[PDB]
Design a protein around this ligand. Sequence first.
Ligand SMILES: OC[C@H]1O[C@@H](O[C@H]2[C@H](O)[C@@H](O)[C@H](O[C@H]3[C@H](O)[C@@H](O)[C@H](O[C@H]4[C@H](O)[C@@H](O)[C@H](O[C@H]5[C@H](O)[C@@H](O)[C@H](O[C@H]6[C@H](O)[C@@H](O)[C@H](O)O[C@@H]6CO)O[C@@H]5CO)O[C@@H]4CO)O[C@@H]3CO)O[C@@H]2CO)[C@H](O)[C@@H](O)[C@@H]1O
Ligand SMILES: OC[C@H]1O[C@@H](O[C@H]2[C@H](O)[C@@H](O)[C@H](O)O[C@@H]2CO)[C@H](O)[C@@H](O)[C@@H]1O
Ligand SMILES: *[C@@H]1O[C@H](CO)[C@@H](O)[C@H](O)[C@H]1NC(C)=O
Ligand SMILES: *[C@@H]1O[C@H](CO)[C@@H](O)[C@H](O)[C@H]1NC(C)=O
Ligand SMILES: [Cl-]
Ligand SMILES: [K+]
Ligand SMILES: [K+]
Ligand SMILES: [K+]
Ligand code: NA
Length: 430
Amino acid sequence: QQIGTYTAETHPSLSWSTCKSSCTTNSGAITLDANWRWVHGVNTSTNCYTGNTWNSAICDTDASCAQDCALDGADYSGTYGITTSGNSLRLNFVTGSNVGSRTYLMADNTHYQIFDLLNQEFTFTVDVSHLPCGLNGALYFVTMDADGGVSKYPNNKAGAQYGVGYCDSQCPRDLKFIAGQANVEGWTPSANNANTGIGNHGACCAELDIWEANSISEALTPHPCDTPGLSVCTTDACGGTYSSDRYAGTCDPDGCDFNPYRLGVTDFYGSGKTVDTTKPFTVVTQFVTNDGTSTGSLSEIRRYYVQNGVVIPQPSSKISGISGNVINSDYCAAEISTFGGTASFSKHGGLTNMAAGMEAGMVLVMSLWDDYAVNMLWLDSTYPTNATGTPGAARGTCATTSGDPKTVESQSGSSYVTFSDIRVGPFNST
Ligand SMILES: OC[C@H]1O[C@@H](O[C@H]2[C@H](O)[C@@H](O)[C@H](O[C@H]3[C@H](O)[C@@H](O)[C@H](O[C@H]4[C@H](O)[C@@H](O)[C@H](O[C@H]5[C@H](O)[C@@H](O)[C@H](O[C@H]6[C@H](O)[C@@H](O)[C@H](O)O[C@@H]6CO)O[C@@H]5CO)O[C@@H]4CO)O[C@@H]3CO)O[C@@H]2CO)[C@H](O)[C@@H](O)[C@@H]1O
Ligand SMILES: OC[C@H]1O[C@@H](O[C@H]2[C@H](O)[C@@H](O)[C@H](O)O[C@@H]2CO)[C@H](O)[C@@H](O)[C@@H]1O
Ligand SMILES: *[C@@H]1O[C@H](CO)[C@@H](O)[C@H](O)[C@H]1NC(C)=O
Ligand SMILES: *[C@@H]1O[C@H](CO)[C@@H](O)[C@H](O)[C@H]1NC(C)=O
Ligand SMILES: [Cl-]
Ligand SMILES: [K+]
Ligand SMILES: [K+]
Ligand SMILES: [K+]
Ligand code: NA
């Protein structure tokens, strides 16, 4: 994708902190993912993409399309409901016909910030108070290229500056641009989302979902892949949520997840609970390595919370067969043994391959979305919906009829998530 000229691209400002075993406030900024943008011909206002289909006059091939179509600048607040205030980022849900957003932290105007998380602690504050059933305010990391692909893929000029280069563990085929090619060939409009479709290519890479949550439930989920960085997959071999068989590909779509409610701890997180989601709170996450160095492999993910200045531990599992309050080799083996299903976490290298994702360096993503595929039931309801009574089926209190996108967009359009005070450093430094 090319760089358009009609609207200047100005990344809203967002500060964040680096901490030492003493913190330094870094100047940062955020960009909007390329899928939300206007895509038009080079030096013309003609759309390359309108509604849920491509303009075959310009985009007669995957390559020509990327050479000949440009992404343009965004009105962050006015069109997408994205604002920043100091160290705080607010993502609105419905803004006209726009639904949510996906944003990336920048190191400069043309590069995503890269985080090296092994043997570090990462902290943020969140307000989920305005996130009802069926929404997901996510803060997580993916193994994207810092420059968004510009150095590797010649047709890609727009790069990180225009939010190009997304990949994740679901191998998304809904992306308009992947690896310097447009996703034109085989494009199939979704029958239910007027803006969206699925192309023949998907963009796979490692994903560390440190935070997927709403006011009801939260989960922490590493997802490894066969290779850490971008791998371009084709059609149904992609696996993930955009394919016939989620387990057909090279990334783990399920992950090794820790949701306190799923693990039997139903009084921990939610309205007026131990972590009271009517108010903001701080989430601290540690990435422990086998040898205690930045170059060891990932042994354990640890977690705690702070609210009203009070430290609140991650609660331990109440499910017979699954112990503790950390994610480690024993926990991941125990989860799949007890809850059952496809061993996709092991098959894609588990924590060793998660570490490879992390060692490559990862981009920070903040998003707010609803889910046409599963209505977010996997996060905050009983799932599968016919598995009531079985261990791990219940993930939160939402009804199994909840989370229908057009429903929640009509009823709860004013929903929003605010992320703030991002901090990273050595353990005990944030
Ligand atoms: O025509 C001339 C005039 O153009 C004006 O500019 C227009 C332009 O013409 C128009 O084409 C453009 O339309 C864009 C809309 O403004 C924008 O809202 C819309 O955004 C969609 C996007 O198309 C779609 O791909 C995206 O899909 C989401 C999906 O909903 C979501 O569920 C999924 O969630 C994932 C999470 O992000 C992730 O964290 C998690 O891990 O996984 C989730 C999935 O499991 O993410 C996908 C995307 O990957 O949804 C958004 C939001 O609804 O995009 C339209 C383009 O396709 O608008 C322009 C501005 O109006 C000029 O302004 C004017 O001057 C010209 O004259
Ligand atoms: O694809 C939807 C959602 O799936 C999540 O994994 C589920 C899996 O779908 C379900 O069959 C199993 O019982 O539970 C896992 C974990 O909740 C996955 O973790 C998400 O990233 C994904 O969005
Ligand atoms: C730049 O675009 C405008 C709008 O299409 C057009 O008037 C002008 O001729 C363009 N430049 C060219 C063709 O070099
Ligand atoms: C249970 O529901 C899932 C999801 O629709 C489906 O795959 C399965 O066939 C259903 N029936 C039974 C008995 O599991
Ligand atoms: Cl869980
Ligand atoms: K601002
Ligand atoms: K994802
Ligand atoms: K309910
Ligand atoms: Na299975």
